């Protein structure tokens, strides 16, 4: 029922560290990761364990914060936009699958607010 998780490294990619990518890992991702609402988002949705047979019928591009954290640690992203795209995909999946007002949606809303606050301060 579960797909293989997303890849977290790109072997042919040159290593390119930047202040913006360090900010995405150590300010943005760290802030959300340590938050009391992080845990539903820290690993791929396990539809077998959670008894969600339709999750991966509805969600075609799975994404979670564990994948984003590993991608940043492995320098998978060429730039900040690509990383921000994965965070947005994670939030989008939550809002498309779960009914508005469900607990996980209220949690996602709060995490997204914090995400956007930190992204607004991305160093130039």
């Amino acid at each position: 029922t579960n797909p293989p998780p997303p890849e977290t490294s790109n072997p042919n990619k040159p290593k390119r560290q930047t202040n913006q990518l360090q900010y995405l890992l150590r300010v943005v991702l760290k802030t959300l990761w340590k938050h009391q609402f992080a845990w539903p988002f820290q690993q791929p949705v396990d539809a077998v364990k959670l008894n969600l047979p339709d999750y991966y019928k509805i969600i075609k591009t799975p994404m979670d914060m564990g994948t984003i954290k590993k991608r940043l640690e492995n320098n998978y992203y060429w730039n900040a936009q690509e990383c921000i795209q994965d965070f947005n995909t994670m939030f989008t999946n939550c809002y498309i699958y779960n009914k508005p007002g469900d607990d996980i949606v209220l949690m996602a809303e709060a995490l997204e607010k914090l995400f956007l606050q930190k992204i607004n301060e991305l160093p130039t």
Binding site: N98, D103, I104
Partner: peptide, 10 residues
């Protein structure tokens, strides 16, 4: 579907 149910802060 019925979604994921109750979620408490961790």
């Amino acid at each position: 579907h019925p979604g994921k149910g109750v979620k408490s802060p961790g």
